[PDB]
């Protein structure tokens, strides 16, 4: 089990790390959000690039990335364009998606990039290799916003990500029942115990899957996602509440 | 699903109820503990009678029960003699055990009694019937301090308790691995979804089973156990910490 060290954060050891997501449609809203978020305590900042309106311009995207980086110089920054197929906000071509991740990698402004496994094995492996050559870590991901696959299916998908070179495999699935939540925890534990040689992020969405966000230290998920202040919809947990539950579980 | 109402507490609805256990070797230590515990917030007080040294005298036991009741007149009080076979502190004959539970039932000082399922089916059913005739609820229990039985075994034991008339079936088992924790949660959920027509208390012990104490609202356990202030050994959770995690999970 190889941990992942980014800036002064060690992923895969100790309590699960807290990721928060920043979402702004343009440079001014990204800046307002970055200044608000630096007054919150969290471990990793994810920038959800699919919410940005001017994604057609690589320079616009990099200018926004710089705004975030100047507001929070020491935070690990994860660049994520979530495709519409996986719940993202906009559809873009495979070429443009790969261009944006490469521009981000080249900028030296981000520490990690999110790569969707279903982008295609050749393109995924090529990008992973490009990232690695530039000292950028890769969060390889997959999201099923509709249902929960079987435990065997989830473990084989996670193993496939490890085979393609992911630094950190990630899977997020939607529960249709409480039983589906147990399936996600089971698959997490199977990965932890027998196949992972690196940190894995797993999560069951919505209100019924909230426990998956709190029990990562037990079953093996290295990071979790929380909301900056004000949790709005069912199933979101504000970062301070999330942090208090993770410390309680850790010191029990 | 029939809930259980004791004093103004409804067991089986809303957040899991918090039980704390009081442990004193004699009348003066029981009184000192009862005065300390009334400055803590919890829902049900369990009196662990097997820690009391003068169990040979029914009158001594009832005098102590009165000390507790006068210190906390409105709290639901559960009378529990835990046998040494199930992790208790002293061994007593089946006759004496049944005598003590009957004296407690007759006193009108306690609201519920704990009855170990393995006491023997005829004696268990007789005591359950005696309790019910005196408006006392029965927590029917079973504890495996060594290992975790299979999910099928646990569900059939819980179903057997429901068949013998338990108001609230309870099972506590020791995990030998993280997998054993998932088994306990699975058995809880199976009971919840298909066989329980009453509240069920389930718990996985020790540090590895702590999550079972926090996720009852999700998988179906109606109560959990916490420590009054100062958690001492690994795996105990202080009641205020436990309460904060249960409210966070409930309002997510």
From Swiss-Prot, chains A, B:
NCBIfam families: aroD (TIGR01093)
UniProt organism field: Salmonella typhi
Regulation affecting activity: Inhibited by (2R)-2-methyl-3-dehydroquinic acid.
Bilayer-spanning residue ranges: none
EC number: 4.2.1.10
Protein name: 3-dehydroquinate dehydratase
Record text on subunit structure and interactions: Dimer of dimers.
Active site as annotated: 143, 170
Function as written in the Swiss-Prot or TrEMBL entry: Involved in the third step of the chorismate pathway, which leads to the biosynthesis of aromatic amino acids. Catalyzes the cis-dehydration of 3-dehydroquinate (DHQ) and introduces the first double bond of the aromatic ring to yield 3-dehydroshikimate. The reaction involves the formation of an imine intermediate between the keto group of 3-dehydroquinate and the epsilon-amino group of Lys-170 at the active site.
Catalytic reaction annotation: 3-dehydroquinate = 3-dehydroshikimate + H2O
């Amino acid at each position: 089990m190889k941990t992942v060290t980014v800036k002064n954060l060690i992923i895969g050891e100790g309590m699960p790390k807290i990721i928060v997501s920043l979402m702004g449609r343009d440079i001014n809203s990204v800046k307002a959000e970055a200044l608000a978020y630096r007054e919150a305590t969290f471990d990793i900042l994810e920038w959800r690039v699919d919410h940005f309106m001017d994604i057609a311009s690589t320079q616009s995207v990099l200018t926004a990335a710089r705004v975030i980086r100047d507001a929070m110089p020491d935070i690990p920054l994860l660049f994520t364009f979530r495709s519409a197929k996986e719940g993202g906000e906009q559809t873009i071509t495979t070429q443009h998606y790969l261009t944006l991740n490469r521009a981000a990698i080249d900028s030296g402004l981000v520490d990690m990039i999110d790569l969707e496994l279903f982008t295609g094995d050749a393109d995924v492996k090529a990008t992973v290799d490009y990232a690695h050559a530039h000292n950028v870590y890769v969060v390889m991901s997959n999201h099923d916003f509709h249902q929960t696959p079987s435990a065997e299916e989830m473990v084989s998908r996670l193993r496939k990500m490890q085979a393609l070179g992911a630094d950190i495999p990630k899977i997020a699935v939607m529960p249709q029942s409480k039983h589906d939540v147990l399936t996600l925890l089971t698959a997490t534990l199977e990965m932890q115990q027998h196949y992972a040689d690196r940190p894995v992020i797993t999560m069951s969405m919505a209100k019924e899957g909230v426990i998956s966000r709190l029990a990562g230290e037990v079953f093996g998920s290295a990071a979790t996602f929380g909301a900056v202040k004000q949790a709005s919809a069912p199933g979101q947990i504000a970062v301070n509440d999330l942090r208090s539950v993770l410390m309680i579980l850790h010191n029990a």
